[PDB]
Short mmCIF file of C-alpha atoms and ligand atoms in Angstrom, two decimals:
data_model
loop_
_atom_site.label_atom_id
_atom_site.label_comp_id
_atom_site.label_asym_id
_atom_site.label_seq_id
_atom_site.Cartn_x
_atom_site.Cartn_y
_atom_site.Cartn_z
CA UNK A 1 123.94 111.29 47.97
CA UNK A 2 123.49 112.44 51.67
CA UNK A 3 127.43 112.51 51.63
CA UNK A 4 127.61 114.22 47.99
CA UNK A 5 125.17 116.28 49.21
CA UNK A 6 127.65 118.55 51.33
CA UNK A 7 130.73 117.80 48.72
CA UNK A 8 129.16 119.88 46.23
CA UNK A 9 128.08 122.31 48.69
CA UNK A 10 124.12 121.27 47.46
CA UNK A 11 123.22 121.21 50.97
CA UNK A 12 124.63 125.72 51.38
CA UNK A 13 122.77 125.60 48.52
CA UNK A 14 119.03 123.52 50.04
CA UNK A 15 119.46 124.98 53.84
CA UNK A 16 120.97 129.13 53.06
CA UNK A 17 119.27 129.22 49.29
CA UNK A 18 116.30 127.25 49.57
CA UNK A 19 117.18 125.52 46.17
CA UNK A 20 115.26 122.29 45.63
CA UNK A 21 115.18 122.41 41.52
CA UNK A 22 111.48 123.50 42.14
CA UNK A 23 109.90 124.31 38.75
CA UNK A 24 112.48 122.34 37.04
CA UNK A 25 112.51 119.38 34.98
CA UNK A 26 114.78 117.21 34.70
CA UNK A 27 115.22 114.10 31.82
CA UNK A 28 117.14 111.05 32.41
CA UNK A 29 117.52 108.52 29.95
CA UNK A 30 118.74 105.47 31.21
CA UNK A 31 117.29 101.54 31.98
CA UNK A 32 114.30 101.76 33.26
CA UNK A 33 112.77 103.27 36.43
CA UNK A 34 111.66 100.81 38.95
CA UNK A 35 108.04 99.22 38.74
CA UNK A 36 108.00 101.18 35.31
CA UNK A 37 104.43 102.80 36.26
CA UNK A 38 103.40 106.53 36.95
CA UNK A 39 101.14 105.37 39.39
CA UNK A 40 101.32 104.72 43.77
CA UNK A 41 102.89 101.68 42.62
CA UNK A 42 106.11 104.32 42.11
CA UNK A 43 109.20 103.70 44.53
CA UNK A 44 108.63 106.53 46.38
CA UNK A 45 111.98 108.58 45.79
CA UNK A 46 109.79 109.29 42.31
CA UNK A 47 106.30 108.84 42.95
CA UNK A 48 104.08 111.97 42.40
CA UNK A 49 106.92 113.79 40.92
CA UNK A 50 106.99 112.03 37.23
CA UNK A 51 106.25 114.61 34.04
CA UNK A 52 106.83 111.30 32.06
CA UNK A 53 107.80 107.66 31.73
CA UNK A 54 108.57 106.70 28.50
CA UNK A 55 109.43 103.18 27.06
CA UNK A 56 111.63 103.23 24.45
CA UNK A 57 113.76 100.10 24.46
CA UNK A 58 110.89 97.82 25.32
CA UNK A 59 107.06 98.95 23.71
CA UNK A 60 104.89 99.42 26.91
CA UNK A 61 107.79 97.98 29.79
CA UNK A 62 110.13 100.93 31.33
CA UNK A 63 110.60 99.33 34.52
CA UNK A 64 114.18 98.71 35.98
CA UNK A 65 115.43 95.10 36.18
CA UNK A 66 119.15 96.23 35.81
CA UNK A 67 118.86 98.66 38.70
CA UNK A 68 121.04 101.48 36.81
CA UNK A 69 118.62 103.82 35.72
CA UNK A 70 116.49 104.23 38.78
CA UNK A 71 119.85 104.77 41.37
CA UNK A 72 120.34 107.13 38.67
CA UNK A 73 117.51 109.39 39.16
CA UNK A 74 117.34 109.00 42.49
CA UNK A 75 121.03 110.36 42.75
CA UNK A 76 119.34 113.54 40.34
CA UNK A 77 116.36 114.60 42.56
CA UNK A 78 114.88 111.59 43.99
CA UNK A 79 112.45 112.59 47.73
CA UNK A 80 112.47 109.72 49.09
CA UNK A 81 112.21 109.81 53.70
CA UNK A 82 116.15 109.22 53.56
CA UNK A 83 118.86 109.82 50.45
CA UNK A 84 117.71 112.24 48.49
CA UNK A 85 118.87 112.72 44.98
CA UNK A 86 120.35 116.54 44.45
CA UNK A 87 117.59 118.07 43.71
CA UNK A 88 114.07 117.18 45.77
CA UNK A 89 111.51 119.16 44.10
CA UNK A 90 112.51 119.12 40.28
CA UNK A 91 110.20 117.03 38.17
CA UNK A 92 111.40 113.85 36.38
CA UNK A 93 110.98 112.66 32.32
CA UNK A 94 112.43 109.47 32.24
CA UNK A 95 113.36 107.84 28.49
CA UNK A 96 113.32 104.01 29.31
CA UNK A 97 116.28 102.74 26.98
CA UNK A 98 117.46 99.29 27.92
CA UNK A 99 116.04 96.44 25.39
CA UNK A 100 115.32 93.26 26.05
CA UNK A 101 118.73 91.72 25.64
CA UNK A 102 120.79 94.11 28.86
CA UNK A 103 121.72 96.84 25.71
CA UNK A 104 120.77 100.16 25.06
CA UNK A 105 118.38 99.60 21.97
CA UNK A 106 116.40 102.40 23.00
CA UNK A 107 118.02 104.99 22.34
CA UNK A 108 117.02 106.84 18.14
CA UNK A 109 119.74 106.23 15.73
CA UNK A 110 119.22 110.17 15.69
CA UNK A 111 120.18 111.55 19.17
CA UNK A 112 118.62 114.53 18.48
CA UNK A 113 114.79 112.99 18.86
CA UNK A 114 115.49 111.94 22.37
CA UNK A 115 116.51 115.24 23.16
CA UNK A 116 113.53 116.72 21.21
CA UNK A 117 111.16 114.09 22.86
CA UNK A 118 112.12 115.46 26.69
CA UNK A 119 112.23 119.09 25.22
CA UNK A 120 108.06 119.11 23.79
CA UNK A 121 107.53 117.72 26.97
CA UNK A 122 109.35 120.44 29.31
CA UNK A 123 112.48 119.49 30.36
CA UNK A 124 115.58 122.10 30.28
CA UNK A 125 118.38 119.72 30.94
CA UNK A 126 119.12 116.16 29.74
CA UNK A 127 121.27 113.86 31.58
CA UNK A 128 123.36 110.58 30.24
CA UNK A 129 125.35 107.98 32.01
CA UNK A 130 126.02 106.48 29.15
CA UNK A 131 127.83 105.88 26.34
CA UNK A 132 130.75 104.11 24.15
CA UNK A 133 134.75 103.64 24.72
CA UNK A 134 135.98 105.32 21.80
CA UNK A 135 139.06 106.69 23.36
CA UNK A 136 138.23 110.42 22.46
CA UNK A 137 136.85 110.21 18.97
CA UNK A 138 133.34 112.22 18.18
CA UNK A 139 130.91 110.50 16.56
CA UNK A 140 127.83 110.88 14.69
CA UNK A 141 126.30 110.62 18.68
CA UNK A 142 128.98 113.47 20.11
CA UNK A 143 127.88 115.19 16.61
CA UNK A 144 123.84 115.18 17.16
CA UNK A 145 124.54 116.57 20.49
CA UNK A 146 126.48 119.84 19.72
CA UNK A 147 123.95 120.19 16.95
CA UNK A 148 120.91 120.09 19.69
CA UNK A 149 122.68 121.79 22.13
CA UNK A 150 123.75 125.06 20.06
CA UNK A 151 119.75 125.01 18.34
CA UNK A 152 118.37 124.87 22.00
CA UNK A 153 118.24 125.12 25.09
CA UNK A 154 119.27 122.05 26.57
CA UNK A 155 121.85 121.44 28.97
CA UNK A 156 122.63 117.95 27.96
CA UNK A 157 125.18 115.79 30.56
CA UNK A 158 126.79 112.62 29.84
CA UNK A 159 129.74 110.13 31.84
CA UNK A 160 132.92 110.19 30.91
CA UNK A 161 133.45 106.62 31.10
CA UNK A 162 134.66 103.81 33.51
CA UNK A 163 137.68 103.03 31.57
CA UNK A 164 140.55 104.95 34.12
CA UNK A 165 143.25 105.57 35.05
CA UNK A 166 144.76 106.10 31.55
CA UNK A 167 144.32 108.31 29.35
CA UNK A 168 142.87 109.15 26.59
CA UNK A 169 139.93 107.08 27.57
CA UNK A 170 137.04 109.76 27.18
CA UNK A 171 133.29 107.80 26.17
CA UNK A 172 131.34 108.90 23.71
CA UNK A 173 128.60 110.90 23.25
CA UNK A 174 131.08 112.66 26.49
CA UNK A 175 133.27 113.41 23.85
CA UNK A 176 130.84 116.17 22.75
CA UNK A 177 131.39 119.66 22.82
CA UNK A 178 128.91 120.63 24.28
CA UNK A 179 127.93 118.49 26.77
CA UNK A 180 128.67 119.01 30.38
CA UNK A 181 131.13 115.62 30.75
CA UNK A 182 131.21 114.13 34.30
CA UNK A 183 134.14 112.67 36.07
CA UNK A 184 134.04 111.02 39.25
CA UNK A 185 136.16 111.69 42.38
CA UNK A 186 135.36 109.62 45.32
CA UNK A 187 132.91 110.06 47.79
CA UNK A 188 133.51 110.90 51.63
CA UNK A 189 132.90 107.05 53.38
CA UNK A 190 135.58 105.13 54.21
CA UNK A 191 134.16 102.62 55.83
CA UNK A 192 134.26 100.98 52.74
CA UNK A 193 137.57 101.30 52.12
CA UNK A 194 139.81 102.97 49.19
CA UNK A 195 137.50 103.67 46.91
CA UNK A 196 135.23 106.35 48.99
CA UNK A 197 138.00 107.66 51.45
CA UNK A 198 139.81 110.87 49.91
CA UNK A 199 137.42 113.36 47.80
CA UNK A 200 140.22 114.64 46.15
CA UNK A 201 141.21 111.33 44.50
CA UNK A 202 139.50 110.81 40.77
CA UNK A 203 138.54 107.52 41.34
CA UNK A 204 140.43 104.78 39.86
CA UNK A 205 138.15 103.64 37.02
CA UNK A 206 137.51 107.40 35.81
CA UNK A 207 137.71 107.65 32.32
CA UNK A 208 140.96 110.03 31.72
CA UNK A 209 141.03 112.78 29.31
CA UNK A 210 142.55 114.41 26.92
CA UNK A 211 139.57 113.58 24.01
CA UNK A 212 141.31 112.09 20.90
CA UNK A 213 142.00 115.81 19.25
CA UNK A 214 143.12 117.05 22.47
CA UNK A 215 140.84 118.65 24.12
CA UNK A 216 140.20 118.92 28.11
CA UNK A 217 137.51 116.53 29.07
CA UNK A 218 135.72 115.48 31.53
CA UNK A 219 134.15 119.15 32.56
CA UNK A 220 133.84 118.61 35.85
CA UNK A 221 134.18 116.24 39.13
CA UNK A 222 131.89 114.94 41.09
CA UNK A 223 131.44 112.06 44.40
CA UNK A 224 130.76 109.02 42.49
CA UNK A 225 132.08 105.84 44.76
CA UNK A 226 129.14 104.44 46.70
CA UNK A 227 126.35 106.32 46.21
CA UNK A 228 123.64 105.15 48.52
CA UNK A 229 120.57 106.35 46.24
CA UNK A 230 117.45 104.41 45.12
CA UNK A 231 117.13 101.25 44.77
CA UNK A 232 114.91 99.38 42.35
CA UNK A 233 112.10 97.03 43.71
CA UNK A 234 113.28 94.52 40.82
CA UNK A 235 116.99 94.47 40.73
CA UNK A 236 119.46 91.61 42.22
CA UNK A 237 122.27 92.12 45.24
CA UNK A 238 124.62 91.72 42.27
CA UNK A 239 123.72 95.30 40.48
CA UNK A 240 124.58 96.80 43.49
CA UNK A 241 128.31 97.89 45.35
CA UNK A 242 126.48 96.98 48.46
CA UNK A 243 123.18 96.77 50.13
CA UNK A 244 121.72 99.40 52.41
CA UNK A 245 117.86 98.99 52.59
CA UNK A 246 115.04 97.11 50.92
CA UNK A 247 114.61 100.53 49.38
CA UNK A 248 118.10 102.45 48.30
CA UNK A 249 121.45 100.66 48.12
CA UNK A 250 124.99 101.53 46.84
CA UNK A 251 126.39 101.87 43.25
CA UNK A 252 129.66 103.67 41.96
CA UNK A 253 131.20 104.72 38.13
CA UNK A 254 130.91 107.82 36.66
CA UNK A 255 127.26 106.77 35.75
CA UNK A 256 126.64 108.15 39.72
CA UNK A 257 128.42 111.14 39.29
CA UNK A 258 126.85 112.70 36.38
CA UNK A 259 123.53 113.05 38.05
CA UNK A 260 124.53 114.36 40.82
CA UNK A 261 126.03 116.89 38.62
CA UNK A 262 122.93 117.10 37.21
CA UNK A 263 120.73 118.11 39.95
CA UNK A 264 122.99 120.26 41.22
CA UNK A 265 122.63 122.01 37.04
CA UNK A 266 118.66 121.92 38.59
CA UNK A 267 119.68 123.89 41.92
CA UNK A 268 121.81 126.62 39.84
CA UNK A 269 119.31 126.83 36.93
CA UNK A 270 116.20 127.21 38.91
CA UNK A 271 118.83 129.96 41.47
CA UNK A 272 119.16 131.81 38.12
CA UNK A 273 115.68 131.27 36.72
CA UNK A 274 114.08 132.45 40.05
CA UNK A 275 116.62 134.68 41.90
CA UNK A 276 118.42 136.30 39.21
CA UNK A 277 116.08 136.97 36.50
CA UNK A 278 117.07 135.25 33.62
CA UNK A 279 116.89 131.93 31.90
CA UNK A 280 120.54 130.85 31.81
CA UNK A 281 121.89 129.22 28.91
CA UNK A 282 123.32 126.10 28.58
CA UNK A 283 126.71 127.60 28.06
CA UNK A 284 126.60 129.79 31.47
CA UNK A 285 125.11 126.94 33.04
CA UNK A 286 128.53 124.99 31.88
CA UNK A 287 130.40 128.14 32.30
CA UNK A 288 129.45 128.76 36.34
CA UNK A 289 129.51 125.39 37.26
CA UNK A 290 133.42 125.24 36.11
CA UNK A 291 134.04 128.60 37.18
CA UNK A 292 133.22 127.84 40.68
CA UNK A 293 134.93 123.93 40.53
CA UNK A 294 137.79 122.62 43.02
CA UNK A 295 141.11 122.15 42.20
CA UNK A 296 141.06 118.58 43.54
CA UNK A 297 144.98 119.33 44.08
CA UNK A 298 146.28 118.32 40.47
CA UNK A 299 146.91 121.48 38.91
CA UNK A 300 145.83 122.26 35.81
CA UNK A 301 145.19 121.23 32.31
CA UNK A 302 144.35 118.18 33.64
CA UNK A 303 142.85 115.66 32.44
CA UNK A 304 142.25 113.56 35.27
CA UNK A 305 140.13 115.91 36.88
CA UNK A 306 139.02 118.33 33.67
CA UNK A 307 138.54 121.92 36.07
CA UNK A 308 137.82 120.16 39.14
CA UNK A 309 134.91 119.65 41.21
CA UNK A 310 131.66 121.42 41.61
CA UNK A 311 131.19 122.88 44.24
CA UNK A 312 128.03 124.94 43.64
CA UNK A 313 127.71 127.55 46.45
CA UNK A 314 130.03 129.92 44.49
CA UNK A 315 128.90 128.56 40.86
CA UNK A 316 124.92 130.06 42.15
CA UNK A 317 126.55 133.74 42.56
CA UNK A 318 128.91 133.93 39.65
CA UNK A 319 128.84 137.61 37.28
CA UNK A 320 127.54 136.17 34.22
CA UNK A 321 127.24 137.23 30.53
CA UNK A 322 124.55 134.50 29.30
CA UNK A 323 125.04 134.72 25.06
CA UNK A 324 124.14 138.21 25.27
CA UNK A 325 126.70 139.43 21.92
CA UNK A 326 128.17 137.50 19.45
CA UNK A 327 131.45 137.33 17.45
CA UNK A 328 132.92 137.50 13.81
CA UNK A 329 136.12 136.59 13.00
CA UNK A 330 138.51 139.81 14.29
CA UNK A 331 135.94 141.04 16.51
CA UNK A 332 136.52 141.38 20.76
CA UNK A 333 133.95 142.20 23.70
CA UNK A 334 135.51 144.35 26.63
CA UNK A 335 133.83 143.42 30.08
CA UNK A 336 135.45 145.02 32.82
CA UNK A 337 135.53 143.25 36.15
CA UNK A 338 136.27 144.88 40.01
CA UNK A 339 138.20 141.86 42.29
CA UNK A 340 139.18 141.89 45.81
CA UNK A 341 142.76 140.73 46.79
CA UNK A 342 140.83 138.29 49.92
CA UNK A 343 139.81 135.65 47.29
CA UNK A 344 140.92 133.55 44.34
CA UNK A 345 139.60 135.07 40.97
CA UNK A 346 138.33 132.69 38.25
CA UNK A 347 136.95 133.18 34.86
CA UNK A 348 135.52 130.85 32.86
CA UNK A 349 134.46 131.50 28.81
CA UNK A 350 132.12 128.29 27.22
CA UNK A 351 131.09 128.18 24.11
CA UNK A 352 128.09 126.13 22.62
CA UNK A 353 130.22 125.91 18.92
CA UNK A 354 128.71 125.03 15.78
CA UNK A 355 128.71 120.31 15.76
CA UNK A 356 132.28 118.99 14.01
CA UNK A 357 132.26 116.71 11.34
CA UNK A 358 132.81 113.03 12.44
CA UNK A 359 135.67 113.17 9.71
CA UNK A 360 137.67 116.43 11.50
CA UNK A 361 140.96 115.90 13.52
CA UNK A 362 140.27 118.91 14.96
CA UNK A 363 136.66 119.05 16.51
CA UNK A 364 136.79 122.75 17.56
CA UNK A 365 135.13 124.76 14.82
CA UNK A 366 135.02 128.76 16.13
CA UNK A 367 138.14 129.77 17.95
CA UNK A 368 137.43 132.15 20.81
CA UNK A 369 140.24 133.16 22.67
CA UNK A 370 140.25 134.82 26.66
CA UNK A 371 142.46 137.05 27.47
CA UNK A 372 142.80 139.22 30.95
CA UNK A 373 144.83 142.17 31.86
CA UNK A 374 145.34 142.73 35.79
CA UNK A 375 145.47 146.22 37.18
CA UNK A 376 148.72 146.33 37.46
CA UNK A 377 149.02 145.29 33.51
CA UNK A 378 149.68 141.16 33.58
CA UNK A 379 148.16 139.64 31.15
CA UNK A 380 146.89 135.98 30.99
CA UNK A 381 145.40 134.06 28.63
CA UNK A 382 142.85 131.53 28.32
CA UNK A 383 143.93 128.14 29.61
CA UNK A 384 147.55 128.46 30.00
CA UNK A 385 148.49 127.96 33.44
CA UNK A 386 152.79 127.99 32.59
CA UNK A 387 154.38 131.65 33.70
CA UNK A 388 154.45 134.04 31.43
CA UNK A 389 151.42 133.32 31.71
CA UNK A 390 150.33 134.61 27.82
CA UNK A 391 152.34 132.57 25.89
CA UNK A 392 150.25 129.83 24.98
CA UNK A 393 146.91 129.94 22.69
CA UNK A 394 144.13 127.61 22.73
CA UNK A 395 143.36 126.69 19.58
CA UNK A 396 141.71 122.99 20.83
CA UNK A 397 138.91 123.51 23.59
CA UNK A 398 135.48 125.11 24.19
CA UNK A 399 135.94 126.19 27.40
CA UNK A 400 138.86 128.85 28.03
CA UNK A 401 139.92 130.02 31.51
CA UNK A 402 141.96 132.05 33.68
CA UNK A 403 142.35 131.27 37.35
CA UNK A 404 144.39 133.33 39.66
CA UNK A 405 144.67 132.77 43.08
CA UNK A 406 146.03 135.98 44.65
CA UNK A 407 143.76 138.21 42.94
CA UNK A 408 145.05 142.04 43.03
CA UNK A 409 142.29 144.13 44.81
CA UNK A 410 141.30 146.01 41.57
CA UNK A 411 139.58 146.40 38.15
CA UNK A 412 140.25 143.42 35.86
CA UNK A 413 139.67 144.10 32.31
CA UNK A 414 138.04 140.01 30.29
CA UNK A 415 138.47 140.43 26.67
CA UNK A 416 136.76 137.60 24.48
CA UNK A 417 138.64 137.89 20.87
CA UNK A 418 137.44 136.07 18.27
CA UNK A 419 140.53 134.30 16.30
CA UNK A 420 138.59 132.06 13.92
CA UNK A 421 134.88 131.77 12.88
CA UNK A 422 134.12 130.18 9.86
CA UNK A 423 130.45 129.55 10.81
CA UNK A 424 129.43 132.90 12.60
CA UNK A 425 128.56 134.55 14.48
CA UNK A 426 129.81 132.91 17.46
CA UNK A 427 128.34 133.62 20.83
CA UNK A 428 129.58 132.61 24.27
CA UNK A 429 129.33 132.87 28.21
CA UNK A 430 131.32 134.20 30.68
CA UNK A 431 131.36 133.22 34.81
CA UNK A 432 133.29 134.88 37.15
CA UNK A 433 133.73 134.03 41.01
CA UNK A 434 135.39 135.90 43.37
CA1 LIG B 501 140.28 106.82 47.72
CA1 LIG B 502 140.77 130.11 21.70
CA1 LIG B 503 152.81 130.28 29.75
#
């Protein structure tokens, strides 16, 4: 956590912006949380900051004999004396879904019930380091995720899966269009070896896009190898990559990368709410993270890294549109942005799409297109990274990007065009870094 904090610039968000996630509530659905009691017996990283602790997988027992869920929550918001999570003043809703058999039987049949329970407890961010290795398929779970986000103010995050490095290995519900799906890059702890020596390396095991219908997943990356975080007092050494002390230890996976981003979302959401006067929609939080993310060096578009590694301080200050307009087929929204040639210009369009059928060969329902015009007339189409940048249109993703490394100082025109919106109208968010 301490090293990941610096990589994703949560350190700047905390030190220069005051953002520790105070006021925000993150829900974590995972194995269990240390002793499983919300009292003084609880691990120092969470004691006193738990909104609710629910036992779903094993009635009357939310403890963590595995260690996975405790480490994960610790990365989101742990507030121990050491190895803090990214949003150490956020409060925790924890839903224990591990069953007696070691599986995830506490999940309800309808995932919407899971998210609703968390919502009623006050959580507005819901993070899930779990999934099924269905090679990019959009399942019932994926559908329910999408349905829920379109209808409710919940930002939902899912791990990409650990089946890399082959392409098309994204887990469900990580295949959901409306979730923030997170892959793992390496932490920088090179004394531990090749799995933690280059922050611009995708971790070998991180699942890789595209999804089954060709979409870019994961959406973003964060350090996920040799992550030092809260160690459940009931978990054995075998659960860890390495020991540290009796209260913290190392783990590695997309399960570790996802909560780092979840805590960053809590920091980001706090910023909008406290400092920017608005409650940002899940689609804006997602757009802001994408626009601020760093190309780890593979270029775009790319299912190994998605849109890149979270860089939180750039996301904080984006120029935005927060679902303030909705569009029907053939309509368009127009904005203008004065750019500065000194630094790159990144514009990202995200929408919380209507949920797909599990039998559709194409999951996108409503298709919006991003069209950018530079001061001198040059036009760019969302996700077209090959020159000429206006001849390849995107009909698959509900994230579209125009990224210009050496922008012209001057006013850029931004169009959001409704190409085909059968379940309309469709709103959207925009985030602009420059
Ligand atoms: Ca490496
Ligand atoms: Ca499009
Ligand atoms: Ca092109």
